[PDB]
């Protein structure tokens, strides 16, 4: 529910003591958490919006030249005036021109002209800046419980909180007063100030499309500056990346507009994050967020809810997620009231032996009439298994053949750990529920390694770090005993390892 | 005289943007618009589940297609070593004053 078939979903251990777990949820890929007969609940970040942003430096990627100007002071008659060069809308490069009896001069030599042409602008690009103020997350909570198939894409049904609850999270209030009608609240507290490295990123805007930009890249662009804002036509700074005028054969000046730099800067961003912006309200995807969940206000809605012998007919044919779970949708044929429906995995007969693990805890029917559709997420054991639904005699079953070993799940978990510690860095080490000095050590070593690693190898992307990884691995194949022996397997491997899982 | 070798577009206008997906084992994605050859097409693998629509679960193909129309282009003409004329100005020092053009 909001997290079945959405893949790159992870699930974490449990409640582990304190009833207070940590998780770094993100924009794509969501987290189910499950803990010790409390309702399993999954959380997704979808749209982090930023309002109220200010405008640091702009850039003009087109030019509009006119009017030009000219000088022509004969040689050894001094330097030329051109009043327009006193005004700041005009651009000038004084050059030297060979002259003679042709060009209207008595003496021979260089004449020192400059055509000073009027710079103007059309279609600039803006570089709007954001601080952690006026920021927002809109996280969503979707407790498994009992919902239909049509109520897991259904965004509108959060107006009454059955299990769906949208929760607006701003960094001035980093706690989620998050009630879930039917049972108790959840109440997760966040750290939005340690977001996705904010106050280091700008919204770059060209024309109706916007993307995030690292600020050192942004200040290193050579185009005009437009430092504050857009009232009238501004004072354009630096004026030399654009309009280019030169001299050949001592005939006039080729004054070139130098055109339009959209594709130039679009090629120049290859590490940007596309956002979208509407009334300003710059909505943003690709964020991650370290909200730590607090349990113990959660409570299973009606653990009692008597067993309800009935007839179970499937609505839909059940399936099997790529994170090895099974999704079953039953009708219950409408006997009586809100009451529990048990399910089992059976390696034995049709009845009488449970294996595996139910994901959705306390699965239930909410309403009395004919077809209440409860969907169940289940976790079969690695071999063969049948599905048992409530009644000890009158029921319908399955077979699944899980098709993956426990060693395959361990390898998939290590590949997911590779992608975690590649994407989120040291912050990915905060999935494991609070570990005292264990995860504090495992976070401290990575935050004192990754800072120095960002200082050394921060400026290298896929193909330029493949080369250094290959070279340092070749060095570690042929060096001495000591430190440099354990250099390649720790560092060239970690370069190619941070490369090949970014995506892909 | 010139001969037109290749032309290179720049400013592309994109519309009609079609898209079609298939359940994770129901084949490759397709849409009629691919038979038009004015349109640009790529086929990515997306997720699919009950919360996506139809399928078993897993990853299914998704094509998206966009109209491609051009506004600015280079003509890119050819030069052959015939077909040209060099203009040479012969000028004799003598009875002439302050000339040069």
């Amino acid at each position, epitope marked *: 529910i909001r997290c079945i078939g959405v893949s790159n979903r992870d699930f974490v251990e449990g409640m582990s003591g304190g009833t207070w777990v940590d998780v770094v949820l993100e924009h794509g890929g969501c987290v189910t958490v499950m803990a010790q007969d409390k309702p399993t609940v999954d959380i997704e970040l979808v749209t982090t919006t930023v309002s109220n942003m200010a405008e640091v430096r702009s850039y003009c990627y087109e030019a509009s030249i006119s009017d030009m100007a000219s000088d022509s002071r004969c040689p050894t008659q001094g330097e030329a005036y051109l009043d327009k060069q006193s005004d700041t809308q005009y651009v000038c490069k004084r050059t030297l021109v060979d002259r003679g009896w042709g060009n209207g001069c008595g003496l021979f030599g260089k004449g020192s002209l400059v055509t000073c042409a009027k710079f103007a602008c059309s279609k600039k690009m803006t570089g709007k800046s954001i601080q952690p103020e006026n920021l927002e997350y809109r996280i969503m909570l979707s407790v498994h419980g009992s919902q239909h198939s049509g109520m897991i894409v259904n965004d509108t049904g959060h107006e009454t909180d059955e299990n769906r609850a949208k929760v607006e999270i701003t960094p001035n209030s980093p706690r989620a007063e998050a009630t879930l009608g039917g049972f108790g609240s959840l109440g997760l507290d966040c750290e939005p100030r340690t977001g996705l490295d904010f106050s280091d990123l700008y919204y770059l805007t060209m024309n109706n499309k916007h993307w995030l930009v690292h600020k050192e890249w942004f200040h290193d662009i050579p185009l005009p500056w437009h430092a504050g804002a857009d009232t009238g036509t501004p004072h354009w700074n630096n004026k030399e990346a654009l309009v280019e005028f030169k001299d050949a054969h001592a005939k006039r000046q080729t004054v070139v507009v130098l055109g339009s730099q959209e594709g130039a800067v679009h090629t120049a961003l290859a590490g940007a994050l596309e956002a979208e912006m509407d009334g300003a309200k710059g909505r943003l995807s690709s964020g991650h967020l370290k909200c730590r969940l607090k349990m113990d206000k959660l409570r299973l809605k009606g653990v009692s809810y008597s067993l309800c012998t009935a007839a179970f007919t499937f609505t839909k044919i059940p399936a099997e997620t790529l994170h090895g779970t099974v999704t079953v949708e039953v009708q219950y044929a409408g006997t009586d009231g809100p009451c529990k429906v048990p399910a089992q995995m059976a390696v034995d007969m049709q009845t009488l032996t449970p294996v595996g693990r139910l994901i959705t805890a306390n699965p239930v029917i909410t309403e009395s009439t004919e077809n209440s559709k409860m969907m169940l997420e289940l976790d079969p054991p690695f071999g063969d298994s049948y599905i048992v639904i409530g009644v000890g005699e009158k029921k319908i079953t399955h077979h699944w053949h899980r098709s993956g070993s426990t060693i395959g799940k361990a390898f998939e978990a290590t590949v997911r750990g590779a992608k975690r510690m590649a994407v989120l860095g040291d912050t990915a080490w905060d999935f494991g529920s609070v570990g005292g000095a264990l995860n504090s050590l495992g976070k401290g070593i990575h935050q004192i390694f990754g800072a120095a690693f960002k200082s050394l190898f921060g400026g290298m992307s896929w193909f330029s770090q493949i080369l250094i990884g290959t070279l340092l691995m070749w060095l570690g194949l042929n060096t001495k005993n000591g430190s440099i022996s354990l250099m390649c397997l720790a560092l060239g491997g970690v370069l190619i390892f941070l490369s090949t899982a970014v995506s892909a | 005289n010139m001969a037109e070798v290749r032309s290179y577009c720049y400013e592309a206008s994109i519309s009609d943007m079609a898209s*079609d*997906s298939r359940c994770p084992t129901q084949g490759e994605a397709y849409l*009629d*618009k691919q038979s038009d050859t004015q349109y640009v097409c790529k086929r990515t693998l997306v997720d699919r589940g009950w919360g*996506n*629509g139809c399928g078993l679960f897993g990853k299914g193909s998704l094509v*998206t297609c966009a109209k491609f129309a051009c506004s600015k282009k280079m003509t890119g003409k050819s030069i052959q070593p015939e077909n040209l004329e060099y203009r040479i100005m012969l000028s004799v020092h003598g009875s002439q004053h302050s000339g040069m053009i």
Partner: antibody
Amino acid sequence: EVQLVQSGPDVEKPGASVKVSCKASGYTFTSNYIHWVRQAPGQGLEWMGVINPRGGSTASAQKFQGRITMTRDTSTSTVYMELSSLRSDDTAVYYCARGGRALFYDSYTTPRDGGSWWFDPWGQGSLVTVSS
Amino acid sequence: DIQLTQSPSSLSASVGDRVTFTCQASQDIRKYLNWYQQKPGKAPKLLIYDASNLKTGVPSRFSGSGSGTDFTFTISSLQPEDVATYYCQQFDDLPITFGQGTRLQIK
């Protein structure tokens, strides 16, 4: 209310192509598959094909392979059916009604149906007459 | 493609009668059949989705049943505004097939 409204009757020549519109009202246009269904005067109904108003995907019957193509307009919330290579057999009345479950893209059938499978918003029935 | 035979071709009955219609597919359609009545050249009146279910707004004199491939539509009480052409519709596999039709006449 939830309603599909079509264009008026058309008279076309054999060998030409006809275009029939189907505009939506009262519901989210990108949430219901538009099915096109023909009906000759005498012979009952016959399903021509299906478009998704999201993403403009199409499929159709085997009797119309290469003869029909369906386009969309998300702005005006309209569905266009262009039937080419017209014959005297194509003189009929054309209908368009929303399939319904139209989550992602194309026909979906092992998932749920019914509740105006497509039996609610049928515009009016565009008469298309192919003669000289 | 998934032939759908509709029996009979046309009927006639007086006001207040019970009448039944049969649709047989050549293939297994589970419970994927639907039922139309269409007044001639008009916006129709709604009978049955999913071969056994009425829709809200439909009067309860119409009913449908059928489990394997044979499906029975049933009007409990015929009324003078129930004269129409009656169709049944497959849902499975695609080339979605309709029945030929069933016309009624007021006696």
